[PDB]
Design a protein around this ligand. Sequence first.
Ligand SMILES: CC(C)C[C@H](N)C(=O)O
Lengths: 147, 147
Amino acid sequence: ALDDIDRILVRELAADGRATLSELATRAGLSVSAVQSRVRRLESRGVVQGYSARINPEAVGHLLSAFVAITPLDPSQPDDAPARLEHIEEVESCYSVAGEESYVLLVRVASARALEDLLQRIRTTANVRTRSTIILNTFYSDRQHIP
Amino acid sequence: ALDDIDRILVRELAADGRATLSELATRAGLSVSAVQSRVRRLESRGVVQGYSARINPEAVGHLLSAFVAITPLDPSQPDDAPARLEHIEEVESCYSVAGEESYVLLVRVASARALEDLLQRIRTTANVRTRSTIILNTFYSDRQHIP
Ligand SMILES: CC(C)C[C@H](N)C(=O)O
């Protein structure tokens, strides 16, 4: 249930998550109260999940990033791997995936040696084997597309 | 350097892109002017790159997401696939990687049949082979860590 106004809003907020209400209003042709109200509804259905500064991972110390695919050492009991890895701050994303492995993580770390220590924490806390793909360079990311 | 006032600043902004200059400055131990100018140098030094709302992709009609691993077919040609694909909009992310493939893409798409289309386009436009891994579920996605 996304009408055209909602599409302009989510599209403007994808590009600028700090658009103020007056800017959005005068872009959608609405009152500032109507915008507030539409935005609130977007947030409470789960259309807008939240708002974030896009931080440069190199500037804060994360010089190495990697994809880690993980697969349960014993796939019999149901899977708590996402829940159990939620406590590891260096895991930034966690997806379940079709094919041979069961999840892919994106992980960020200070160095090669910090990566090896983190792979150990991952194997032990979710009881998983790991396959690691170091990222060499990010050309662009999160380029969110509203059709 | 990142003066750890700067650290409490980027942590607060990573979890809330719409925190306001006022509510920051408090939990920061500063003034709505100090806080305010700092944040402008953070965007200047490329430490915060942007602000974005986090849009749920299913809610806007991206029912299938995928990692698409790509390798150029001819190594006598310049390897420019990131630039070559930058105009295709359903490629949300592009990374060069150290593993089997040269790059990894994250792609979002309407349906299994639209993915087939998109892959064929990726292949004919960069000049690549594709190997894709279907995302079943996002448990959490860019939860940025600041040490
Ligand atoms: C989500 C996973 C436990 C499923 C498995 N990797 C498959 O492709 O069938």
